[PDB]
Design a protein around this motif. Structure first.
Motif, PDB file in Angstrom:
ATOM      1  N   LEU A   1      59.611  43.452  23.032  1.00  0.00           N
ATOM      2  CA  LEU A   1      59.934  42.462  22.832  1.00  0.00           C
ATOM      3  C   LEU A   1      61.854  42.534  22.653  1.00  0.00           C
ATOM      4  N   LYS A   2      62.558  41.491  23.843  1.00  0.00           N
ATOM      5  CA  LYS A   2      63.545  41.346  23.648  1.00  0.00           C
ATOM      6  C   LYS A   2      63.539  42.829  24.621  1.00  0.00           C
TER       7      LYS A   2
ATOM      8  N   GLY B   1      72.259  43.015  23.231  1.00  0.00           N
ATOM      9  CA  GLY B   1      71.058  43.859  22.950  1.00  0.00           C
ATOM     10  C   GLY B   1      71.044  44.273  24.084  1.00  0.00           C
TER      11      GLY B   1
ATOM     12  N   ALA C   1      64.970  48.023  23.592  1.00  0.00           N
ATOM     13  CA  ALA C   1      64.377  47.197  23.908  1.00  0.00           C
ATOM     14  C   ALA C   1      63.127  47.637  22.324  1.00  0.00           C
ATOM     15  N   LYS C   2      62.624  45.946  22.087  1.00  0.00           N
ATOM     16  CA  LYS C   2      62.147  46.424  20.845  1.00  0.00           C
ATOM     17  C   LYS C   2      60.410  46.107  21.169  1.00  0.00           C
TER      18      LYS C   2
END
Lengths: 372, 168, 260, 232
Positions: free
Chosen positions: A287-288, A292, A295-296
């Motif tokens: 995710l993502k 930013g 990284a998620k």
């Protein structure tokens, strides 16, 4: 003097429902959404179950039977009740599998919770007779107070400027008289130290003169003073002269009642291969992506930062179902806010191959066919 | 009638109102339940059945023995009742009784989690196979949901592109 | 809550005369079944299984890994009492219909006698030895012998936990090792994916456990001793047990179709 | 012909002060061990394993469906003797050098106590609980608690391996271990003495609890080899 009917309700199952605890604390100054709300960090309402026979009738031990449209069909029957009877004469409920199964997922990782360590890894258990302690005595010295985790006073660094002023004028200001007595007890013991010693080779603690002068001797050494003030207000130590001082004390138990394992110093014996080196890997989502500055990834319902290392760089619409990589959870801990932060570490190649073999989806079987 | 007073009425009120209004039922446990469950928020994810079978569940509850009781599961309530017992009978403080009972709760939960791992592990040593674990199942459902999001995203993305041709 | 129940013919107070003394039966059933049930109750004290019978728990709580530990206690309690409901105070004469069918599937009553007994010692582990009645759509009723490791359900609805083969010594590099290995993975892969390896009739009627034999240590370690010197021991326990089989009741559960 | 080894400190007659009685030890080791050896002697009659030791038989006859009975008796006989080889007559103190490493792998002695005892009580099928030392990335001296189910050996060789000496030093994903301390859970050791355990008193739990107070820690430290920071 309680009536018999009133004595049964006290011990009833419904009366045992815990009060709705405050939601997971967030930044007091943000732009949270109102109409739409996502899942919370930790559950707030009690999850409920019922028998397979009573579920087919909508009976959940509540005011009225719930509808069968959205309450039957699922494997795990879980439901949360916001209000047993709202202004619409209906039990305002909602599915509770969001948090109910997340606890089961996390408990399938077989990972304990350990106190965070500043950056020689030392994963110390949370449930110990030296650190996990709430009760105390006034006679206890300042050093042991660091061990504790449940402080009565608030965290100064965390409190907002408005909350701080209110605290001063409603908790600290109306305590000078009591604080003066606290000093008298200390000064009283000080006079007994010299006496006891010389006797080898306590007073009434009523001296309003030494107290006033005693505080004028500590104005040059502010450190020893705060050390003493922290004991009268039960404030969490902040300066190194340390534990969980960066983000403050944990609002809840360090484990947050999600896992009660003390250590992970075990080796799961595999049937065929034998005692494995590391723990079995776990597949996680992406995710993502980076592009930013991090990284998620979704590791068993929870969101954690990606391993320190394609897949993470850029998004790929072609990949069906999203980018899914195997990964090993190394360390898990609960921050001050109550979130469950995981130290997700890249997994090995053989571990994934071994773990997939049982699933039956391993392309090549290590057993037998593998010549080398 | 004058309803039952579950709490001492305000003695200072000179002209009290709502004299014929039922009062709230508050027990000493309410304070303890709030404290415990705030220290263990994820203890609420453990499903708890509030559907009474026959109502005779408080007849075999003797908190002098320990947390484990007949008819009720090991949950936060057992800790509170045990805490209240020690605090009253053994003349302990709120914190002291809280520590003792709470620690017994941990040890009982640890074994429960250890059995699961050792159960599945030992079962495979003698040819025991199981179904899809909850972890795998959860990931599968996300795939079906993520794919649906991809379709919607693609459509709306194309919508804006076609909607951008009209600006010029 | 699940509570202990009496035995068939007052074996708790007297016990079988020539098989197990009353004290041995006391420690084997009353002091063990109670322990298992005590643990079982705590596990299902607040779940849907709070009022389900042992067998229902066994079949229901089988595939799910998260509830594996509940299967053990429930299954063990069932098999244990299943092993005592087939003995008799006095030896019973084998039924004619049953006597005939046995020879048609095993060749002789003694051939099957030495097979079950032999299988027991061969296992060198705690387990239950069964006598299963196999039946298929067109195939006649045929009997066979099955070995279950630790807690193993002989029913076809609990195939996941049958535990019929110890993977420790049955999976090596020899030709048999590879063969056993493939089956081990084939079952796991099939079960996991949900595929069915062997079709079974609805209701789990293909296999009906008629007789059982508890080979756990606690049952015989007291009366017969360690077995050093061959005097007594686990071997003698199985032998003596063969003389108290209530063949009458065994015949009833067999429900053999009239073919004589 | 393997003969019965005498117990370390004449426990056969004297017995442990508070762990086991002479009668219990008689059935646990004096009688049971002899049973296994007697059956093991009849399986290796005039063969390669005639003069080999117990350990060698385990590694040699490792995971072979033809030598199942051999491995079973051999492994059990060895493990049984190994379990009784770490029982001190009186409660001995734990060395400082060992007390330090335990706190680096488990955090506290009580944690290890509950982890070892816990794994025993939580195992339905009879087995052994092993405390083995290994070398892992980040911890040269690493102590782990492992459970071998039924007759399984804890040694690395006692498991399936690949080819290319053709056999690899370790099994797929496995590591090298050194069994230090053991705990027999078979009914022979604890059933007769502590009983079934109905009512939560005596039983297998009390057995493991009394086993923690009679561990010859002096010998535990010796086999730990804390000096060898790098094991290969």
């Amino acid at each position: 003097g309680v009536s018999p009917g009133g004595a049964l309700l006290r011990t009833s199952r419904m009366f045992s429902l815990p009060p709705v605890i405050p939601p997971p604390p967030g930044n007091k100054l943000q732009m949270i959404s109102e109409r739409a709300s996502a899942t919370e960090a930790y559950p707030t309402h009690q999850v409920l179950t019922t028998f397979e026979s009573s579920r087919s009738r909508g009976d959940w031990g509540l005011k009225r039977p719930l509808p069968l449209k959205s309450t039957t069909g699922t494997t795990y029957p879980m439901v949360k009740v916001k209000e047993m009877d709202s202004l619409e004469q209906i039990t305002d409920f909602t599915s509770g599998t969001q948090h109910g199964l997340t606890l089961k997922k996390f408990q399938a990782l077989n990972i304990p919770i350990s106190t965070p360590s500043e950056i020689r890894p030392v994963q110390r258990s949370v449930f110990e007779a030296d650190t996990d302690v709430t009760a105390f005595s006034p006679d206890e010295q300042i050093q042991e107070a660091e061990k504790r985790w449940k402080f009565s006073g608030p965290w100064l660094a965390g409190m907002t400027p408005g909350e701080f002023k209110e605290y001063l004028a409603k908790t600290v200001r109306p305590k000078r008289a009591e604080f003066r007595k606290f000093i008298q007890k200390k000064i009283a013991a000080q006079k007994t130290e010299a006496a006891n010693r010389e006797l080898q080779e306590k007073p009434e603690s009523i001296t309003d003169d030494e107290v006033t002068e005693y505080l004028r001797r500590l104005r040059n050494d502010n450190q020893v003073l705060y050390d003493l003030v922290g004991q009268f207000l039960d404030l969490a130590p902040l300066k190194p002269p340390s534990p969980y001082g960066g983000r403050g004390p944990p609002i809840t138990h360090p484990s947050a009642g999600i896992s009660y394992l003390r250590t992970a110093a075990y080796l799961n014996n595999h049937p065929i291969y034998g005692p494995q080196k590391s723990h079995p890997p776990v597949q996680a989502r992406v995710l993502k992506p980076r592009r930013g500055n991090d990284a998620k990834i979704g590791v068993a319902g929870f969101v954690a930062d990606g391993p320190l290392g394609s897949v993470m760089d850029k998004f790929d619409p072609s990949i069906e179902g999203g980018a899914k990589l195997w990964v090993n959870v190394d360390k898990a801990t609960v921050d001050s806010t109550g979130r469950v932060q995981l130290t997700v570490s890249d997994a090995k190649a053989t571990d994934v191959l071994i773990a997939k073999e049982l699933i039956g989806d391993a392309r090549e079987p290590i057993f037998g066919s593998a010549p080398k | 009638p004058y309803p039952i007073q579950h709490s001492p009425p305000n003695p200072r009120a000179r002209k009290p109102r709502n004299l014929f209004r039922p009062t709230k039922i508050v027990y000493p446990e309410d304070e303890l339940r709030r404290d415990f469950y705030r220290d263990h928020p994820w203890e609420l994810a453990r499903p708890r059945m509030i559907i009474e079978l026959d109502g005779k569940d408080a007849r075999f509850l003797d908190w002098s023995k320990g947390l484990r009781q007949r008819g009720i599961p090991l949950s936060g309530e057992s800790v509170v009742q045990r805490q209240l017992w020690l605090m009253e009978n053994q003349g302990m403080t709120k914190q002291e009784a809280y520590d003792k009972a709470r620690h017994e709760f941990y040890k009982l939960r640890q074994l429960e989690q250890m059995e699961r791992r050792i159960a599945v592990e030992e079962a495979r040593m003698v040819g025991g196979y199981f179904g899809k674990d909850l972890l795998t199942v959860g990931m599968e459902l996300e795939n079906k949901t993520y794919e649906s999001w991809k379709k919607w995203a693609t459509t709306e993305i194309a919508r804006q592109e076609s909607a951008r041709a009209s600006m010029y | 809550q699940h509570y202990l129940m009496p035995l068939r013919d007052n074996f708790e107070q007297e016990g079988i005369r020539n098989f197990l003394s009353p004290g041995s039966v006391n420690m084997a059933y009353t002091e063990y079944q109670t322990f298992i049930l005590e643990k079982l109750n705590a596990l299902v004290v607040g779940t849907d299984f709070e009022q389900k019978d042992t067998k229902s728990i066994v079949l229901a709580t089988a595939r799910d890994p998260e509830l594996a530990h509940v299967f053990n206690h429930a299954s063990m309690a069932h098999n244990n009492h299943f092993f005592f409901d087939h003995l008799s105070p006095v030896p019973v004469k084998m039924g004619d219909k049953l006597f005939y069918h046995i020879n048609e599937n095993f060749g002789s009553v003694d051939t099957l006698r030495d097979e079950m007994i032999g299988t027991a010692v061969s296992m060198f582990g705690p387990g239950f030895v069964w006598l299963v009645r196999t039946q298929l759509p067109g195939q006649p009723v045929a009997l066979r012998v099955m070995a279950t490791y630790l807690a193993g359900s002989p029913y076809p609805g609990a195939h996941w936990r049958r535990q019929e083969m110890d993977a420790q010594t049955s999976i090596g590099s020899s030709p048999q090792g590879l063969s056993n290995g493939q089956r081990f993975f084939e079952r796991s892969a099939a079960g996991f994916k949900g595929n069915k390896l062997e079709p079974t009739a609805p209701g789990g009627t293909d296999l009906i456990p008629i007789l059982c034999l508890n080979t756990w240590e606690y049952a015989w370690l007291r009366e017969y001793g360690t077995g050093v010197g061959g005097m007594g021991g686990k071997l003698a326990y199985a032998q003596s047990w063969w003389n108290m089989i209530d063949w009458a009741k065994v015949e009833e559960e067999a429900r053999l179709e009239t073919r004589i």
